[PDB]
Assembly symmetry: C3
């Protein structure tokens, strides 16, 4: 599966230019942030993305945009943070910012830091993922494309 | 993927008659979830999923396939969490679909008929269609 | 999908000798106390590689494939929850399979040998078969090769 990723700021672009055949692509926490105790926080990941796969014939009564998945990384387990919706389902048509809904199960504030990696993108196929950085997902303004400001 | 869905009552039938990689399922009756609890919430439907037959590696045309029960992203706005993370409905399962919901709150939580907290999903992530049937077979 | 499983002890081997579904249940292999309000990396005493028919995939005969670790539905009646929601095991991973279990209770939780709390699942949702092997490959991490 191939991901076209739009970085929503230059700071985020630099992180993905220096990204430090896996079935999961790690996403960065892009800003230092304090998560309140016993709370759910909708953490903005500073990116938009579309996923591309080979077209396949499916029962329903060359390359296509596909739905994809937002998994916790296994290393999330050592923290008190849990993905509220278990596994995120990103539909083929979504053009908004990718967000991780994080439950802080601790009674203390939790500090996430720029460069932390708590979540990853995954294909329904489970195949290796490649990605590229693009300026827009499509022609629409929500896709960051098209004429004008 | 195409689903054949048996609604276990006419009240449920009506909801789905008047109903994307995920097919939203309805909460079918008003219910109180106790604080700090897990409740097996009955969704009032039975279902089988149909896909094209595939060659798969295994050591000893349309087929029924296993499918998945996901939380809806909007569940995050509630204190409810799916206890088993993602439900796996085996190809051979004929019973009612249940959502095992944890109430993470220290107070009771009220779910309402017509609430949409969970969704069915194919292993392929392909769009879903459904029809209502009287029997699964 | 077909799994080649290395059992890390004879005790575990005996469990899997005496074990069609989309999920292959894995055993808890040792009695263990999970502390209240904790996350415990529970060692499952196995290593495993998954095999599927090769498929063409967009990226810019049988092969090693990635697979998934799901909670079993019966975990729901316990206070135990899978910390990382669903586990992702990358193609060819050679480490011991671990279940990171949150004990959400304020009491210690006793897991028992023979308990079944998690299962392996294919990305295709196809039936799983398995065989017991002594190594995954020639590497020490695969439990194979010379020595020592
Ligand atoms: C509105 N999103 C859902 C969208 O996000 C996309 N989406 C879906 C799943 C996911 O894990 N991440 C994500 O960005 C597609 C969905 O259409 C709300 C939201 C809810 C749960 C997780 C993440 C976001 C939301 C709620 C409150 C504040 C901000 C965002
Ligand atoms: C018996 N189901 C498991 C089946 O339900 C099907 N199943 C599986 C996963 C799921 O999320 N939902 C579901 O309906 C296929 C599984 O084979 C018990 C059950 C336990 C936990 C969650 C959901 C159901 C159960 C036990 C006692 C009372 C009611 C339900
Ligand atoms: C190193 N694993 C991650 C790998 O485990 C494999 N892995 C992945 C997901 C999973 O649920 N179980 C598992 O064994 C493939 C992943 O690449 C660490 C780990 C962290 C949390 C849960 C499970 C494992 C780990 C860290 C420290 C001590 C023991 C285990």
């Amino acid at each position: 599966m191939h991901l076209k990723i739009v970085c929503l700021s230059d700071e985020v672009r630099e992180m993905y230019k220096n990204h430090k055949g896996d079935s999961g692509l790690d996403l960065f926490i892009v800003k230092d942030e304090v998560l309140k105790p016993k709370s759910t926080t909708f953490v903005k990941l500073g990116i938009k993305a579309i996923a591309l796969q080979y077209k396949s014939n499916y029962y329903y009564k060359n390359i296509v945009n596909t739905s994809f998945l937002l998994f916790p990384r296994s290393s999330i387990s050592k923290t008190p943070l849990r993905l509220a919706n278990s596994i995120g389902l990103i539909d083929a048509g979504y053009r908004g910012e990718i967000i991780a809904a994080l439950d802080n199960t601790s009674d203390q504030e939790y500090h996430i830091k720029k460069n932390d990696k708590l979540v990853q993108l995954v294909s329904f196929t489970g195949e290796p993922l490649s990605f590229e950085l693009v300026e827009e997902l499509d022609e629409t303004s929500r896709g960051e494309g098209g004429f004008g400001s």
